[PDB]
Amino acid sequence: SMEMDEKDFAADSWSLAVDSSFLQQHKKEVMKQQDVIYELIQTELHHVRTLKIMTRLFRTGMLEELHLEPGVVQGLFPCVDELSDIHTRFLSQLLERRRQALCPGSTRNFVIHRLGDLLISQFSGPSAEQMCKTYSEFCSRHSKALKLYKELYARDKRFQQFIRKVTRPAVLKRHGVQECILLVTQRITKYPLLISRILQHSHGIEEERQDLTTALGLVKELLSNVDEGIYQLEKGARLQEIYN
Amino acid sequence: AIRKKLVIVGDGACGKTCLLIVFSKDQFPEVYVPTVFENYVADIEVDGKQVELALWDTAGQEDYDRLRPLSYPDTDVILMCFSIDSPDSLENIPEKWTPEVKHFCPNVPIILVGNKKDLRNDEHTRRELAKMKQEPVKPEEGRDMANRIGAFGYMECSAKTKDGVREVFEMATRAALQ
Numbered sequence: 534s535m536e537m538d539e540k541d542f543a544a545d546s547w548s549l550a551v552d553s554s555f556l557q558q559h560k561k562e563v564m565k566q567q568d569v570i571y572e573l574i575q576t577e578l579h580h581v582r583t584l585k586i587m588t589r590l591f592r593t594g595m596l597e598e599l600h601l602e603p604g605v606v607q608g609l610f611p612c613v614d615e616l617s618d619i620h621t622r623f624l625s626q627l628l629e630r631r632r633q634a635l636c637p638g639s640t641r642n643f644v645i646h647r648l649g650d651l652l653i654s655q656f657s658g659p660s661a662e663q664m665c666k667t668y669s670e671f672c673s674r675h676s677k678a679l680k681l682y683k684e685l686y687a688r689d690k691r692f693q694q695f696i697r698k699v700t701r702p703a704v705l706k707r708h709g710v711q712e713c714i715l716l717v718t719q720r721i722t723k724y725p726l727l728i729s730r731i732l733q734h735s736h737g738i739e740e741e742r743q744d745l746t747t748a749l750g751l752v753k754e755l756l757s758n759v760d761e762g763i764y765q766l767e768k769g770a771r772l773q774e775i776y777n
Numbered sequence: 778a779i780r781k782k783l784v785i786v787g788d789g790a791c792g793k794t795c796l797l798i799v800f801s802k803d804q805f806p807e808v809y810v811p812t813v814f815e816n817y818v819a820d821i822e823v824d825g826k827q828v829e830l831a832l833w834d835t836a837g838q839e840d841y842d843r844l845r846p847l848s849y850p851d852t853d854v855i856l857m858c859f860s861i862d863s864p865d866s867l868e869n870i871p872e873k874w875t876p877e878v879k880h881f882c883p884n885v886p887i888i889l890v891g892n893k894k895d896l897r898n899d900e901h902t903r904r905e906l907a908k909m910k911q912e913p914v915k916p917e918e919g920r921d922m923a924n925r926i927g928a929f930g931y932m933e934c935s936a937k938t939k940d941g942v943r944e945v946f947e948m949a950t951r952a953a954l955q
């Protein structure tokens with residue numbers, strides 16, 4: 534992550550991020566809505582950062598320092614480039630919406646009144662198709678990635694020393710290889726929980742209540758499609774085991 | 778320290794996300810209770826042994842039967858959660874959650890946990906349940922269910938007051954070590 538965005542999302546809530554003289558001018562219902570919108574963006578910022586750890590610390594470090602067999606690194610980090618593009622673009626849009634909403638003379642005081650339209654765009658058309666195909670691929674390769682990691686850690690001493698070295702910093706405590714993989718798989722099922730709670734505090738404007746209800750329906754359709762498109766791959770699985 | 782993995786399972790209304798947040802945070806969430814839990818690695822010392830306990834939630838995965846099992850690989854301890862203000866969440870334990878956990882996590886200890894124990898003597902809770910011919914889950918109903926499903930043990934807590942929360946995670950660490 535970049536320092537500018539980390540400081541903007543350092544507080545435990547929107548009500549603690551904004552100045553208290555700005556907070557006091559708003560109704561409690563607006564503060565409740567903004568607190569959940571802030572959590573959505575803060576968790577998306579953390580999710581993009583998990584993907585950057587996977588591509589730039591783990592993936593690139595393995596290609597540059599290790600002598601692994603070709604196609605091994607791809608098995609460990611399936612679809613990470615595609616996933617990083619999808620989520621970095623979505624995050625860019627969420628952060629621009631916040632930036633546009635800032636008061637002149639402030640880098641922290643804002644209210645996002647329109648979010649539903651942005652969530653509909655992300656979870657419909659070509660961008661929904663790309664998230665659906667990418668998560669169907671990633672989640673079907675998840676078990677194989679963990680087993681490949683465990684195989685290399687137990688048999689390759691150099692790989693073992695590499696892992697101990699790059700995961701040693703305290704900021705990486707919950708971001709080892711297997712932890713990053715499960716963090717990515719779990720991301721998509723967080724969206725209906727966050728959107729339903731934003732919707733619960735967005736009844737003031739009927740257009741916004743409608744857009745958030747549409748977005749919620751779109752995310753659930755995507756999750757159901759991803760769930761139905763999963764079939765766990767197994768390294769060295771025989772054809773007979775697959776067609777039975 | 779040795780690394781152990783904990784996963785919490787249970788219905789959407791069981792309070793599992795709140796339990797993981799209150800244990801992991803440090804300062805109680807008096808301003809905002811987060812909607813979601815990402816992960817956490819707790820540093821725990823139990824009976825003289827130091828353990829790194831990785832914490833995971835299955836909230837959001839309840840309706841997705843093919844995504845949900847991806848949370849199970851290499852789990853060392855399962856917390857099986859139900860809500861004391863929801864006898865329906867207790868009834869879903871033996872024939873929905875227990876067979877799935879025994880299938881994907883064979884020989885992994887399960888601790889059955891009764892969340893929201895503060896609501897056992899709440900007036901609004903008792904009145905709302907009385908309309909549907911129900912009452913808050915009794916301690917003996919929790920123990921008998923834990924005994925019936927082959928649970929390692931039965932524990933109660935309140936994420937709201939923090940009572941019993943530390944004891945649940947210390948016991949889960951001991952269970953993961955056996």
Ligand SMILES: *CC(=O)N1N[C@@H](c2ccc(C)o2)C[C@@H]1c1ccco1
Pocket residue numbers: 661662663665666669757758759761762
């Ligand atoms: C993964 C993906 O992009 N798609 N899943 C589709 C679907 C419909 C029913 C099921 C089980 O899966 C729809 C969507 C798509 C759009 C265009 C081509 O595929």
Ligand SMILES: *CC(=O)N1N[C@@H](c2ccc(C)o2)C[C@@H]1c1ccco1
Pocket residue numbers: 792793794795796799806810893936937
């Ligand atoms: C899950 C749980 O035990 N709790 N959730 C609470 C809450 C407060 C506001 C909203 C939308 O939900 C109340 C209770 C709690 C409070 C602090 C710790 O747990």
